[PDB]
Amino acid sequence: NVTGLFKDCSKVITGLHPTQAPTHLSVDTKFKTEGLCVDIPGIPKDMTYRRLISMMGFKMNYQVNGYPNMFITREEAIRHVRAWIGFDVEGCHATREAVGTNLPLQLGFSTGVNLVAVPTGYVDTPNNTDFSRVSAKPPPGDQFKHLIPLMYKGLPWNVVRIKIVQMLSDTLKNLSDRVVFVLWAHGFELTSMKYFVKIGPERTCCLCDRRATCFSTASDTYACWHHSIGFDYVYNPFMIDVQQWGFTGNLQSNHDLYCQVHGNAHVASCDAIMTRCLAVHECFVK
Amino acid sequence: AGNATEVPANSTVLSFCAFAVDAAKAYKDYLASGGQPITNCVKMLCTHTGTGQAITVTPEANMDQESFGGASCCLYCRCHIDHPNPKGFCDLKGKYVQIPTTCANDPVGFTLKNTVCTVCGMWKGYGCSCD
Ligand SMILES: O=C(c1ccccc1)N1CC(O)C1
Ligand SMILES: [Zn+2]
Ligand SMILES: [Zn+2]
Ligand SMILES: [Zn+2]
Ligand SMILES: [Zn+2]
């Protein structure tokens, strides 16, 4: 029994030395005997590897005192309709030195904003995990051809996450004390959130009594949407996956049952607008 | 394509700690709310006649310890997140770590909560000959 979370996507034929492998599964077979591992004199550690580790497959089903649930019920989401932001991500595929994982490329929101990131992954090395640019290509097919020019228009993730926090803060500061990301088939959106979301216990802002919605790695401080200028992470967001409400078929076919004003322009922001629109029609119309 | 590194019993705890502002506090809180410790560590077979020093080049478990692969006992290596060290490098990856047998059910939690004496090389409270 294995999971795809933290799958090693490198093309290295062998596993790791016992001192460098993060897990027993990832140790090379040559060291495995009698149910455990052995150190073998004369078999050295590898001092130059770069192994891409997949961030697909997160499971946010913990129940830890004082930490809020990220995924919320339809009833809780309805009460916080003013906090709804549709979110969709179009990815690119690892290539060359790695294969088998998707990296965020175009991040789209129901505000109409599309942000483009440099293809970046989590690469294990002999000393740490290096969050770095990795070789990538858009998926093949005419439905994905629009992503080709985006491979050279990306911004570094330290810039993209600041822009996400600024956009959310500007949109929501007079609407809600939180954000509820409205998703359709959430797996890749949750993988993309690893790049710009942090979690922890509920906190209050560094300048008022409002709950904290943002975090700064510069000062290790917390802010609400009003006081988050310069903050780089979204803190304790909420989310809901609309696809889990009983719909069959794709996003567009279900969106089109209630709405005709949102034509499919085939972009992350358009999928994010259709997802929020479908949720609004399903919960509030008629 | 690719090769799995993890088992499903660790998905929840690793996801929780991978997103936390404070991963060490999140792991401690996860255990206090009844969660299971991280499993699938690299436990070594050895002769239990070693020096007993905490962090070593080869397994050095004495009869009161077990030896593990160092990266596998490091929360930051297991979650693929930043290390707290100034330059962001790991002091356990590429070494073996000796853990008291009484604590070997949770090697990741042990390394998070304990300190190595710089003078004698043994864990403070679990072998240190200085105090
Ligand atoms: O033993 C492993 C391994 C590497 C990384 C993660 C898990 C297992 N390999 C032999 C070669 O096909 C890759
Ligand atoms: Zn505030
Ligand atoms: Zn619509
Ligand atoms: Zn480490
Ligand atoms: Zn000492």
Side-chain angles (χ1 to χ4, degrees), chain A, chain B residues 1-130:
Chain A
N1 212 8
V2 303
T3 175
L5 181 58
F6 303 161
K7 182 180 69 184
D8 182 316
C9 300
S10 79
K11 299 180 172 167
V12 188
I13 296 300
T14 47
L16 289 94
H17 187 269
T19 63
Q20 299 176 310
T23 70
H24 174 88
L25 287 185
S26 63
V27 170
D28 191 73
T29 312
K30 69 177 76 159
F31 305 99
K32 297 177 177 170
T33 192
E34 301 172 11
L36 295 180
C37 298
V38 287
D39 181 71
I40 302 172
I43 305 303
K45 296 181 313 192
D46 176 344
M47 294 314 294
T48 67
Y49 68 86
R50 285 185 62 82
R51 291 171 172 271
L52 182 64
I53 300 305
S54 179
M55 298 294 144
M56 302 185 311
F58 288 118
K59 296 292 179 272
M60 312 307 282
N61 54 357
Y62 49 84
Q63 298 281 285
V64 182
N65 191 268
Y67 292 73
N69 287 322
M70 279 170 68
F71 283 80
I72 59 173
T73 65
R74 169 180 166 145
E75 295 82 10
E76 189 167 338
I78 281 168
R79 293 191 286 273
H80 297 278
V81 62
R82 302 303 188 213
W84 291 8
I85 300 289
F87 173 56
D88 179 64
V89 185
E90 301 301 329
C92 57
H93 289 171
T95 196
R96 298 221 306 109
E97 303 92 0
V99 65
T101 198
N102 204 11
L103 309 145
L105 176 59
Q106 185 183 57
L107 297 103
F109 301 87
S110 58
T111 56
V113 170
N114 288 289
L115 298 169
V116 184
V118 167
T120 307
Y122 292 83
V123 179
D124 272 6
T125 76
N127 301 299
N128 69 0
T129 294
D130 185 14
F131 177 69
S132 49
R133 175 180 212 132
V134 293
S135 299
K137 74 180 206 321
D142 282 294
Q143 68 263 33
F144 305 121
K145 74 180 147 52
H146 64 289
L147 297 173
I148 289 163
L150 310 188
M151 306 300 299
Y152 54 80
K153 299 185 178 161
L155 300 189
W157 261 103
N158 65 295
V159 175
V160 175
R161 63 177 68 98
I162 290 170
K163 291 182 174 287
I164 293 173
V165 167
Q166 169 180 73
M167 178 209 57
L168 293 173
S169 293
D170 283 341
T171 301
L172 295 170
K173 62 182 163 187
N174 295 314
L175 285 179
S176 179
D177 68 335
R178 64 199 57 208
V179 55
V180 173
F181 291 119
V182 183
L183 312 174
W184 177 276
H186 73 269
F188 190 55
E189 284 63 49
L190 180 58
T191 290
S192 300
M193 290 176 192
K194 163 67 205 195
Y195 290 73
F196 67 89
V197 168
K198 296 289 195 171
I199 71 178
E202 283 285 276
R203 297 291 297 265
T204 65
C205 174
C206 67
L207 290 165
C208 72
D209 297 26
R210 291 174 181 108
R211 76 181 281 281
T213 54
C214 307
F215 173 74
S216 173
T217 61
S219 55
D220 292 328
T221 58
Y222 297 87
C224 67
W225 304 127
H226 293 276
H227 310 110
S228 65
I229 195 159
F231 278 56
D232 55 332
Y233 279 88
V234 173
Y235 185 71
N236 288 354
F238 301 96
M239 52 209 72
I240 185 154
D241 182 350
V242 180
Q243 195 189 38
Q244 300 183 156
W245 298 354
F247 300 105
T248 73
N250 72 6
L251 168 63
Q252 196 194 337
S253 69
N254 288 286
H255 165 268
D256 292 3
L257 296 173
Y258 310 91
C259 175
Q260 295 92 24
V261 314
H262 294 118
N264 196 351
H266 306 287
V267 190
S269 60
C270 186
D271 276 11
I273 288 168
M274 287 193 197
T275 300
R276 187 189 193 272
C277 175
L278 168 64
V280 173
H281 278 89
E282 168 63 38
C283 298
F284 302 98
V285 174
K286 280 192 165 176
Chain B
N3 292 282
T5 67
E6 271 293 5
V7 299
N10 289 328
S11 297
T12 307
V13 63
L14 295 173
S15 298
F16 180 56
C17 294
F19 277 77
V21 162
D22 187 334
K25 176 189 198 310
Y27 188 62
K28 297 174 193 166
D29 295 344
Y30 184 83
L31 297 171
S33 282
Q36 295 297 313
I38 287 167
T39 191
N40 190 23
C41 299
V42 176
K43 187 178 172 172
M44 307 308 293
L45 286 164
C46 67
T47 62
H48 291 96
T49 61
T51 66
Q53 288 212 27
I55 302 170
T56 58
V57 168
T58 66
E60 291 285 358
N62 66 22
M63 267 299 281
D64 291 326
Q65 293 168 334
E66 304 304 336
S67 288
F68 293 86
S72 80
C73 300
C74 175
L75 186 64
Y76 312 97
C77 285
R78 296 301 299 263
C79 296
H80 307 276
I81 57 180
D82 284 351
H83 283 75
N85 301 91
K87 295 286 154 286
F89 302 127
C90 186
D91 283 327
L92 294 174
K93 182 175 272 184
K95 297 287 185 280
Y96 288 100
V97 63
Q98 276 62 234
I99 304 284
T101 58
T102 59
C103 304
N105 65 307
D106 184 12
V108 175
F110 184 90
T111 67
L112 280 172
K113 289 166 207 47
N114 288 283
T115 293
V116 178
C117 174
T118 61
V119 183
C120 72
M122 284 178 202
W123 291 106
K124 290 279 193 195
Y126 295 95
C128 173
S129 60
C130 304

